[PDB]
Amino acid sequence: GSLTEDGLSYKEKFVVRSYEVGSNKTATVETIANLLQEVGCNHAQSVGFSTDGFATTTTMRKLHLIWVTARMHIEIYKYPAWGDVVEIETWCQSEGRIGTRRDWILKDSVTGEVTGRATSKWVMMNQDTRRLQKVSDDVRDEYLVFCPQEPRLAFPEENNRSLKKIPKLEDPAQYSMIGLKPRRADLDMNQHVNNVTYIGWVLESIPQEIVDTHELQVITLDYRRECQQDDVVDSLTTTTSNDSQFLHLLRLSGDGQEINRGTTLWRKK
Amino acid sequence: GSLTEDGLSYKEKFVVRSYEVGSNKTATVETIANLLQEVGCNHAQSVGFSTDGFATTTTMRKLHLIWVTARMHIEIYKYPAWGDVVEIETWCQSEGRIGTRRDWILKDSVTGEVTGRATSKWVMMNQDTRRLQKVSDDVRDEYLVFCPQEPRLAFPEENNRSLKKIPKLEDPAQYSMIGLKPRRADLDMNQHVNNVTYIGWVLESIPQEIVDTHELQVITLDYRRECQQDDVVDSLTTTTSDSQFLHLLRLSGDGQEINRGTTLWRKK
Ligand SMILES: CC(=O)N1CCN(c2ccc(Cl)cc2)CC1
Ligand SMILES: CC(=O)N1CCN(c2ccc(Cl)cc2)CC1
Structure with missing residues (x-):
């Protein structure tokens, strides 16, 4: 894996393993989700952030602050088969007062076609109290130098599926x-x-x-x-x-x- | 991954992933076991056997016969850390009447030191009836050309931990x-x-x-x-x-x- 030429995104290739596939001999959505998490962790390591899943700075660590996933949205067009090489590109962006976002694009290495895409919304929280808190300008400034500042969306459409409100299931469940x-x-x-x-x-x-x-x-x-x-x-x-x-x-x-x-x-x- | 020069064993390198480690920031024994299974699967693929975990032949497939694990024995000296590259070498050997065996050696790619070793015993059985079956000479002959015939053991010590009989736990369990x-x-x-x-x-x-x-x-x-x-x-x-x-x-x-x-x- 490596940061791209402009240093504002990260790419990594993965060969699908035998224990990673389902009944169709193609990767499961849990294998895909594990790979998205893996490439996010390698992007954080490449620029000096924590590699525990919380991608924190020294300043956040002394205040016991972490980044936590609020929503994950994944859309798959073609699940890669066992032995196929899938290339994943990931980047992150600030959404000001709403929180932050990490996006991913999955491609077939051989053809170069987009086989899937994902987005995730994150919020800052105190690790011990679980209380959400707004990101300070001094913390935010350390991250912005690694993000594109022009909007770069894996899901750009007008009222796309990634932003729809989800209702609460009512009993009895089917x-x-x-x-x-x-x-x-x-x-x-x-x-x-x-x-x-x-x-x-x-x-x-x-x-x-x-x-x-x-x-x-x-x-x-x-x-x-x-x-x-x-x-x-x-x-x-x-x-x-x-x-x-x-x-x-x-x-x-x-x-x-x-x-x-x-x-x-x-x-x- | 690739078969070695003599074609009688297979080697593959793996970089330890973030979700593959435990509280020590090193690979769990389940991650190691998944990797042993993965390299065994790639060895089967490299010489034309099935890639479903049963490493069958066309002849076995028409008779509904499979290879099943009877015992797995793993010994780890050093668990690889997140981001480390571990190299795994695997081979298989026939044990005649007893069944068959697959062995593995795990090494640190940087130092070349042996960090772990594993062995597994397999038996042939009908997938539907679950009855154990003796391997025929015609089936056995298809596999021997991919195995070393001089004994090559990951655990050579005479009557070592891998061969010890295991008793049945008696109630109450602790x-x-x-x-x-x-x-x-x-x-x-x-x-x-x-x-x-x-x-x-x-x-x-x-x-x-x-x-x-x-x-x-x-x-x-x-x-x-x-x-x-x-x-x-x-x-x-x-x-x-x-x-x-x-x-x-x-x-x-x-x-x-x-x-x-x-x-x-x-x-x-
Ligand atoms: C672990 C992870 O993927 N994330 C998402 C992106 N994150 C982020 C934070 C601040 C700014 Cl300005 C931009 C982005 C927080 C951590
Ligand atoms: C699935 C697996 O790991 N194995 C290795 C041992 N096997 C084997 C069969 C016949 C002979 Cl002669 C030698 C070895 C069966 C397949």
């Missing part, structure tokens, strides 16, 4: 998968549940018949609260719709405290 | 983690639970204090029965001692055994 718990492989280096695990938990309540006869085209996920190492989660799904659409909700098994909500769009094979 | 279920990420391309998931399930019943103050040095795991997509598993552990543990994975309901194993941990 489908459910209960008692989901994270194991040590689901945790990052700081013992937090990896964002990719929540994607897997959302998809667990999709009926296998849909998975067998459709391909996942779009996934949007809002992150409201962290699932702790010892928490148990319920995954709820209701069909909202050639295409199938679902509304999703992840909540704690006991009190029903919401941790995530999202929507998925599937296309018939 | 520690337990119950109700473990596989999700779609735990399945391979043919919807079977990946062997690496069972390693993760075994380790779930190790107390976090041990994980926090020790490094896993050796793991031996016997595979008795497959956990299906809709099965629920209980993971049991009892200290037998460095720290040593006896492990047992069984179905949550009837207590049917799926795996047994032992782990050895070294104080940090």
Whole structure:
């Protein structure tokens, strides 16, 4: 991997592994999400930011401040097959008062065609209190020199899917998968549940018949609260719709405290 | 990756990824196990065998025959750190009547030192009936041309840790983690639970204090029965001692055994 010529974005190539593919012999959306996270981590390492997933500065670290994902939106046109080389380009931009954004473009290395795209919205928060806080000018100034300042969007369209408001699923859910718990492989280096695990938990309540006869085209996920190492989660799904659409909700098994909500769009094979 | 000069082994390099490391910022044993499986798959692809994990021949495929792991034994001296390059060499050998074997040597790419080693025993069986079958001479002959015929062992010590018999844990277990279920990420391309998931399930019943103050040095795991997509598993552990543990994975309901194993941990 390497920063591009203008130093305002980062590119990396990946060969799809045997354990990274699903029933179609192509990479799963969780393998894609792991790769987006990996290239974001390598971009941070390339310019001196933390490499723990929070991409902090020394100033943020002494104030116990971190960057946290508020929303992840992924759209895949073609899932790469086992042994294929996928090239991923990533960049970040400030959105002032709303927070910050990281975008990605996935391409087939052989043809150069865009096979997928993703965007994520981030907010600054105190690590201990979990209270959101506005980024100071002195912290912001350290990041702007690594971002393009002219808008560069992976999703430029007028009222695109990445910005749509997601409603809360109402009981009873059409489908459910209960008692989901994270194991040590689901945790990052700081013992937090990896964002990719929540994607897997959302998809667990999709009926296998849909998975067998459709391909996942779009996934949007809002992150409201962290699932702790010892928490148990319920995954709820209701069909909202050639295409199938679902509304999703992840909540704690006991009190029903919401941790995530999202929507998925599937296309018939 | 590539076959070596003599064509009797295969080598591949891997750079450790950010999501592949544990609290020590070094690769987990599950990341190592995934890499061993990956290099075994690439070795099969490089000489025309199936690439689904069963490394079958056309003849085996028409008879519904597969190679299945009976035992996996891994010993790690140094876990590679995030961003390090690890080189893995793998080869396979026939053990006649006992079944077959795949071995691996892990090295630090920069220094060339051996950082780990692994061995696995395989048996042939019918995929539908699950009955073990003796390998025919015509099937065996297709594989021998890709194996060294002089013994080449990752664990040569006479009656070493890789060959020790594992006893069955007796109730009550000292520690337990119950109700473990596989999700779609735990399945391979043919919807079977990946062997690496069972390693993760075994380790779930190790107390976090041990994980926090020790490094896993050796793991031996016997595979008795497959956990299906809709099965629920209980993971049991009892200290037998460095720290040593006896492990047992069984179905949550009837207590049917799926795996047994032992782990050895070294104080940090
Ligand atoms: C970990 C990660 O991908 N991100 C998204 C981009 N981030 C960012 C922060 C400040 C400014 Cl001015 C611009 C961008 C925060 C961290
Ligand atoms: C999947 C896997 O790792 N293996 C290695 C050992 N195998 C093998 C079979 C026959 C002979 Cl003669 C030698 C070796 C089966 C495939």
